[PDB]
Design a protein around this ligand. Sequence first.
Ligand code: NI
Lengths: 128, 5
Amino acid sequence: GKQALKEKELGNDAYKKKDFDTALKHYDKAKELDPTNMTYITNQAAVYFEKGDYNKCRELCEKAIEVGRENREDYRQIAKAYARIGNSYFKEEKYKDAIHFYNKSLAEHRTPDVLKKCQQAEKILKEQ
Amino acid sequence: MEEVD
Ligand code: NI
């Protein structure tokens, strides 16, 4: 499992500098080596989110959750996957869906950042 | 940016 984590980290470093092609290629190698790890998939979802491809981001998040449900110990990462789907809807101003997925996320694992994002989306929707 | 793990 060692090499996969090395590949993931080189991908993370690239992602942060906005070098998305490099990030995807290293995450691909990490997935090839450790296919039951949903983190490499959610990381690829982050890359598409930042490229503005919200649909692909959500497709990957759904995929990650599928993989994660197999290993019944990833509740925190599943919460993260749901939150990312929520964020992608938020970016597109599709607030009802953003709120709905933040709730799915919170039910798995409550986090202050997701709660804050949800409250923000709730305030925007309520006013509308 | 979105957070990576
Ligand atoms: Ni490389």
